[PDB]
């Protein structure tokens, strides 16, 4: 129970990460030469 | 035979001018690189000499002329000019391009197309003597005078802004407003390249 409470507090604090990495990949995923 | 070991190549110059050794003082200020020392010699020489003798001294030495010329285009500072000094400097040095550019620069300050074209006329007047070498610039000036007239015409007929736009920009506005009859006149008149005109024409219609 104590453990559960601790986990909850962390979660509240956190409330982008999930939908940020994907942002980046689309940009990357095209060409690798300015030529 | 010996401006010698003494002293600090830096105040052997007022010494030099005290001994009325003109140009030697100037040269030492130029060699020093110190723009303050250079101005000092230039300002004294101006107060001392007839401008024509002053002009001859400073024109032999690029850095000197350069600074005189800068100050002539910055006496407010920025914007305002000492245009009289510049015209005289360039005339006594046969710097016909630089002298013509002064009138051109003035045409860009005229609130009316008629005055601006007048300044452009003066610009050309300097250039017709030679003629050769200035073939391009004379042509460019003649072009500008024509486009300005045609653009005020457009302003009067079509009731919109046109004066001041570039040749390309004028076609664009004419085409975007559906006046293809006028826009084709510009193209034929100023011999606008095919690839350019096709490109302009395309960009205009989509707008």
């Amino acid at each position: 129970x104590x453990x559960x409470x601790x986990x909850x507090x962390x979660x509240x604090x956190x409330x982008r990460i999930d939908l940020l990495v994907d942002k980046t990949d689309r940009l990357g995923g095209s060409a690798r030469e300015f030529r | 035979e010996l401006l010698n070991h003494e002293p600090r190549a830096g105040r052997q110059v007022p010494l030099l001018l005290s001994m009325e050794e003109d140009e030697l003082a100037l040269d030492k200020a130029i060699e020093s690189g110190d723009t303050d020392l250079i101005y000092f010699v230039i300002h004294q020489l101006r107060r001392k000499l007839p401008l024509a003798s002053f002009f001859r001294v400073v024109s032999s030495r690029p850095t000197a002329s350069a600074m005189v010329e800068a100050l002539a285009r910055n006496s407010d500072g920025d914007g305002n000019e000492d245009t009289a000094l510049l015209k005289d400097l360039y005339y006594q040095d046969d710097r016909r391009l630089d002298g013509a550019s002064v009138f051109i620069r003035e045409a860009l300050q005229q609130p009316e197309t008629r005055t601006a074209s007048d300044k452009l006329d003066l610009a050309a007047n300097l250039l017709q003597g030679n003629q050769k070498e200035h073939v391009f610039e004379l042509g460019a000036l003649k072009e500008a005078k024509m486009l300005l007239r045609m653009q005020e015409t457009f302003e009067r007929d079509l009731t919109d802004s046109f004066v001041g736009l570039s040749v390309n920009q004028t076609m664009f506005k004419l085409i975007k407003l559906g006046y293809h009859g006028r826009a084709k006149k510009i193209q034929s008149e100023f011999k606008v390249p095919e690839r350019v005109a096709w490109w302009i024409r395309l960009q205009a219609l989509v707008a």
């Binding site: 940009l27 990357g28 690798r32 | 350069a66 391009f136 072009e143």
Partner: protein, 604 residues
């Protein structure tokens, strides 16, 4: 005991504040705009208020508030305009006042005679407590010192103003006064030689003083913590800054424009982004080729996300108590990544446009050595599509500088395109480019490159890029951008001549290897090659473990050149500490803006 960039920052801050003490009581501040920026690098605006500053005002605004009584001016003293601007403001308050006010002026770096005459022929010279603020190098990074003279390129190459050359000499001399004489002064270019000449003239003037009982105790001997100073004149290699820069920081400067380690953006008026080596992310991103920025940005987002998830393990107080501690360091990295993404994403949409690719295509073709005439139709199409004037002018200058002038027939077509495409006002713009010798006819003696075939002739004959392309391996079609093995990665296959010349001095073995310590220093072994670059080649000598090396750029340096230089600094990390100095941070657009007439033939 060697050179540390922080002591420059500290002295700069200490000299400014020591003058603020000098003005007793609280004070209102008036700063030259293009000086406010650089100042923010040496002092906090926070710190300034504590020393008694109430409100901040820009000098060029003509709206100084009468709030506090004391009015303090800080402006560069070499500026003719700045003198007039302050003088105008000193009257805009003697005839609109309510009190008398005491006026203090801090000239950077010195009070000049001209300044006084402008102030004198307005009468206001007498009511002015004028002090000097010896600011020279602004330390932008630990390895980058810059005078931050933004108009230095116009001043030097158009106006023919020796002030930037003069100041830089003084700045460098300051380094000598504290850490000892440069053992060697190695350089290339007319204004590089001028800097060296001013360094020897100033040295002697210190000895004329000490000999003649001016004292100063001593008395400079060759340094023990400095290997040498290498001085490059920008006018030796105009091509590199003309090219569109392809590193991350380069493209930011190319598109957003970076001033004083800062810039403005719209996507989280606009907001001011800090761009310096503090941000741990930007440090790694800035010097990288823009291609791999995505790959690098993702790898960090991919690692950040699996660093937030992590450490929910030992779910008892401690291993969570320790996690919330290291928590503000996550949010910063999270907000940094979103900024440098949005920015990256915006630079990307720009590089995908047909115009950009058309520009790069022409730049690359010309640099590679293709027949410039083959790029004509492409340039003409670009003008027809109304691409920004600076980009077109950069191509024409790149065209002209790489082909030893422009053919008479093609020249006239180019002048017609610029004029009829952007305005006849640019009859002046082309004339300025002609004085800068970056857009010339082939029939001009100034357009000629240096050859050991066409006899002598030409005192100021230009850099032979055709010769130097081969001899110095200016083109590297190898170089992988994910893990660069040469400085040519900053232009995706082109190594900058300027940095390549530095390598003629610093990395002789490597430079020999790609064309098949202690000594021998200097240009030794590359004399014939460097002979083919514009201007004088020199190496003056003035009379244990790792020492510092100053690479000095007279007339501007680019972010591409800084990164390339940093790449070398790493390779030499063992035996050398490389410190970059420059008059300003320059780029193609700043260069062009120097020549471009803004008047307009329109309605007033």
């Amino acid at each position: 005991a060697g050179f540390d960039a922080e002591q420059v920052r500290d002295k700069a801050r200490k000299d400014l504040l020591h003058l603020l003490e000098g003005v007793r009581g609280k004070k209102n501040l008036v700063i030259e705009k293009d000086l406010a920026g650089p100042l923010g690098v040496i002092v906090k605006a926070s710190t300034l208020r504590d020393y008694g500053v109430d409100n901040f005002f820009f000098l060029e605004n003509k709206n100084t508030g009468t709030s506090q009584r004391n009015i303090v001016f800080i402006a560069r003293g070499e500026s003719v305009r700045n003198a007039h601007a302050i003088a105008a403001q000193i009257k805009r308050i003697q005839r609109e006042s309510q009190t008398s006010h005491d006026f203090h002026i801090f000239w950077v770096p010195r009070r000049t005679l001209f300044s006084d005459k402008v102030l004198e022929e307005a009468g206001v010279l007498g009511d002015a407590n004028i002090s000097e603020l010896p600011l020279y190098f602004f330390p932008l990074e630990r390895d980058v010192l810059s005078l931050e003279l933004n108009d230095s390129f116009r001043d030097l190459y158009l106006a023919k103003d020796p002030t930037p050359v003069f100041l830089l000499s003084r700045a460098l001399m300051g380094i000598q006064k504290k850490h000892g004489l440069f053992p060697r002064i190695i350089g290339k270019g007319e204004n590089a030689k001028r800097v060296a000449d001013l360094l020897s003239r100033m040295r002697q003037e210190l000895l004329a003083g000490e000999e003649a009982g001016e004292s100063d105790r001593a008395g400079l001997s060759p340094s023990t913590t400095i290997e040498s100073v290498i001085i490059i004149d920008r006018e030796v290699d105009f091509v590199t800054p003309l090219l569109t820069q392809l590193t991350y920081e380069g493209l930011i400067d190319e598109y957003f424009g970076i001033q004083n380690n800062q810039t403005d953006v719209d996507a989280v008026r606009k907001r001011k982004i800090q761009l310096d080596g503090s941000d741990s992310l930007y440090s790694q991103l800035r010097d990288a080729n823009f291609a791999i920025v995505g790959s690098l940005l993702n790898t960090v987002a991919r690692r950040l996300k699996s660093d937030y998830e992590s450490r929910h393990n030992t779910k008892t107080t401690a291993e969570l108590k320790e996690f919330v501690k290291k928590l503000p360091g996550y949010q910063a990295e999270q907000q940094s990544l979103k900024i440098h993404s949005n920015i990256a994403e915006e630079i990307i949409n720009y590089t995908r446009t047909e115009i950009f690719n058309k520009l790069l295509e022409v730049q690359q073709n010309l640099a590679a050595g293709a027949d410039p005439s083959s790029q004509f139709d492409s340039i003409e199409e670009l003008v027809a599509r109304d691409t920004p004037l600076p980009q077109v002018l950069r191509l024409l200058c790149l065209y002209s500088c790489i082909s030893g002038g422009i053919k008479t027939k093609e020249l006239d077509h180019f002048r017609r395109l610029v004029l009829q495409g952007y305005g006849h006002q640019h009859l002046l713009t082309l004339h300025n480019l002609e004085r800068l010798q970056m857009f010339l006819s082939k029939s001009s003696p100034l357009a000629s490159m240096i050859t050991m075939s066409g006899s002598s002739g030409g005192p100021d004959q230009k850099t032979n890029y055709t010769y130097l392309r081969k001899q110095l391996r200016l083109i590297v079609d190898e170089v992988n951008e994910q893990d660069p093995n040469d400085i040519a990665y900053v232009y995706s296959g082109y190594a900058p001549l300027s940095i390549r010349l530095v390598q003629c001095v610093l990395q002789k073995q490597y430079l020999l290897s790609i064309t098949k310590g202690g000594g021998a220093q200097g240009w030794k072994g590359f004399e014939e090659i460097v002979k083919h670059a514009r201007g004088p080649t020199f190496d003056e000598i003035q009379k244990g473990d790792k020492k510092t090396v100053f690479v000095v750029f007279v007339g501007g340096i680019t972010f591409t050149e800084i990164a390339a230089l940093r790449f070398i600094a790493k390779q030499e990390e063992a035996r050398r500490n490389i410190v970059i100095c420059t008059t300003s941070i320059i780029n193609g657009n700043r260069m062009m803006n120097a020549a471009i007439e803004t008047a307009t033939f329109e309605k007033t």
